[PDB]
């Protein structure tokens, strides 16, 4: 499986900071690596565990965030998606 451990789902978040992403992969295949991304958009990728990206400096918005593993072999892993939701300020 593949899981994005931070952010939790619904979390909140303030304008600027950069958003910090971790996802675990249980495979008995090797991951060549975890791509991270916001909606469509591909954050970026992470070839060794512990898989992290960042959306740094992060704008106002909701952000769908998924990680996908690649295997060695090709085969994609999907995560459930994670959405946040990063605001000007956050009481
Ligand atoms: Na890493
Ligand atoms: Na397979």
């Avoid at 789902?9 to 992403?21: P, V």
């Avoid at 740094?56 to 996908?68: D, M, Q």
């Amino acid at each position: 499986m593949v899981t994005i451990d931070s952010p939790v789902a619904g979390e909140r978040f303030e304008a600027g900071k950069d958003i910090n992403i971790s996802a675990t992969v249980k495979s008995k295949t090797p991951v060549s690596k975890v791509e991270f991304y916001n909606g469509d958009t591909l954050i970026s990728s992470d070839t060794t565990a512990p898989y992290t990206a960042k959306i740094t400096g992060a704008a106002v918005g909701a952000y769908n965030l998924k990680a996908v593993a690649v295997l060695s072999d090709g085969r994609r892993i999907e995560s459930p998606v994670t959405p946040v939701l990063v605001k000007v300020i956050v009481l």
